[PDB]
Paper text:
Major histocompatibility complex (MHC) class I molecules (MHC I) present antigen peptides to the surface of antigen presenting cells (APCs) to active T cells through interaction with T-cell receptors (TCRs), which play pivotal roles in antiviral defense. In this study, we screened bat MHC I Ptal-N*01:01–binding peptides from different bat-borne viruses (HeV, EBOV, MERS-CoV, and H17N10) and determined the structures of bat MHC class I complexed with these viral peptides. The overall structures of Ptal-N*01:01 display the common characteristics of classical MHC I molecules in other mammals, with the extracellular region of the heavy chain folding into three different domains. The α1 and α2 domains construct a typical PBG that contains two α1-helices and eight β-sheets, and the α3 domain and β2m display typical immunoglobulin (Ig) domains and underpin the peptide binding domain.
To elucidate whether the peptide-presenting features of a bat MHC I molecule can be influenced by binding to human β2m, we solved the structure of the Ptal-N*01:01 heavy chain complexed with human β2m (Ptal-N*01:01-h) at a resolution of 1.6 Å. Comparing HeV1/Ptal-N*01:01 renatured with bat β2m and human β2m, the structural conformations of both HeV1 peptides in the two structures are also similar, with an RMSD of 0.228 Å in the two binding grooves. In addition, the overall structures are quite similar, with the RMSD of 0.564 Å of all atoms. And the key residues binding to α1α2 domains and α3 domain of the Ptal-N*01:01 heavy chain are highly conserved in human and bat β2m. It indicates that the structure of the peptide loaded in the groove of Ptal-N*01:01 was not affected by the substitution of the β2m subunit.
Numbering used by the authors:
A (entry chain C): 1 to 8
B (entry chain B): 1 to 99
C (entry chain A): 1 to 197, 202 to 220, 231 to 249, 260 to 277
The structure:
């Protein structure tokens, strides 16, 4: 799976 | 950061006239990612050319493979025409059978 | 020695041409196995290596789960492009790029050797997860806006959990399910060609993994062949070192 994405 | 593309034009297998092959144009080392790549046959644009999914190297520079099936002949001339913001005019690299 | 599961995201704005575009790809070692492209209509995560045509058998929700993640990531990095543009006091008129690379290096026995999560803005380092997976390093002053946000939000802990857990587990699953693709060590097909002007050219074709040593000059960059393998040439004896060769080969015209 893809990891989490965090907003810059 | 802006980086101009490196270009290699080549076939998947050693070219033998009359035998089916793949014409490849590998563009790498560039930034930003928007790039125009055309494969040319006797100077004309080959339709339905496909490309690999956009990826990049550890230095953040992008790389793409453009490709199409083709059957080499003795006289037909193939090239790859690349345009990019770093290029004051489009760059043409001719396919050479022996590289 | 080890194996790696590596993901690559690129998001870029296109002012005047609609919403930003988002592309994600995943690799195990030198083999790409998944892609997502937000410009597709109803875009989905899609397989790009043979074993991923079978993952639905043991994991029927794989494609829905990762499509949902990627669609969400595309929307997040659309706003992320606006945020970072603002941190740098940039105008809305130009195109800018966010890139992310993350993944895990895993040695024999399945132990995490290194986890990473790095971001770039306009082709230069922006922020990175520290090797301890517990804090972040901003590459410049503008990126401290993100570092402060991510520190307070506790996102290193979420990355740490993925990199130590899911990343390693998925790498092991893909290595076994994809054995015939990933665990092969295909040696180069090698030969010398001869062109008088005289040029000797040593070829290495169809090899995997990408690492190779070619020695005799002009040495071209290693290039994909389009079928999942690689090529190189160098243009007296030519010597070839590759993982798939029991011993270094020697060739002459």
């Amino acid at each position: 799976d893809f990891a989490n994405t965090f907003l810059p | 950061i802006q980086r101009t593309p490196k270009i290699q034009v080549y076939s998947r297998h050693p070219a033998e006239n009359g035998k089916s092959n793949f014409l490849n144009c590998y563009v790498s080392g560039f930034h930003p990612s928007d790039i125009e790549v055309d494969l040319l046959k006797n100077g004309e644009r080959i339709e339905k050319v496909e490309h690999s999914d956009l990826s990049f190297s550890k230095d953040w520079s992008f790389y793409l493979l453009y490709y199409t099936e083709f059957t080499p002949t003795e006289k037909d001339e193939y090239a790859c025409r690349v345009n990019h913001v770093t290029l004051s005019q489009p760059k043409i690299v001719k396919w050479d059978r022996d590289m | 020695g080890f194996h790696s599961l590596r993901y690559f995201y690129t998001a870029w704005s296109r002012p005047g041409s609609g919403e930003p575009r988002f592309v994600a790809v995943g690799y195990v070692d030198d083999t790409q196995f998944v892609r997502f492209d937000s410009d597709n209509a109803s875009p989905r995560a899609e397989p790009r290596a043979p074993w991923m045509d079978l993952v639905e058998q043991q994991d029927p929700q794989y494609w829905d789960r990762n499509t949902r993640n990627a669609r969400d990531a595309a929307q997040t990095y659309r706003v992320g492009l606006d945020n970072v543009r603002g941190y740098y006091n940039q105008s809305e008129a130009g195109s800018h790029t966010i890139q992310r690379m993350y993944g895990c290096d895993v040695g024999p026995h399945g132990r995490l050797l290194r986890g990473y999560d790095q971001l770039a803005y306009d082709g230069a380092d922006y922020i990175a997860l520290n090797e301890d997976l517990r804090s972040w390093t901003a590459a410049d002053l503008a990126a401290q806006n993100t570092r402060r946000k991510w520190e307070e939000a506790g996102y290193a802990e979420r990355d740490r959990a993925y990199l130590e857990g899911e990343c390693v587990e998925w790498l092991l699953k893909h290595l076994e399910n994809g054995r015939e693709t990933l665990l092969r060590a295909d040696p180069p097909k090698t030969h010398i060609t001869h062109h008088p002007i005289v040029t000797l050219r040593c070829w290495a074709l169809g090899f995997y993994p990408e690492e190779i040593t070619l020695t005799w000059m002009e040495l071209v960059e290693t290039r994909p062949d389009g079928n999942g393998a690689f090529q190189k040439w160098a243009a007296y004896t030519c010597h070839v070192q590759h993982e798939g060769l029991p011993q270094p080969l020697t060739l002459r015209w």
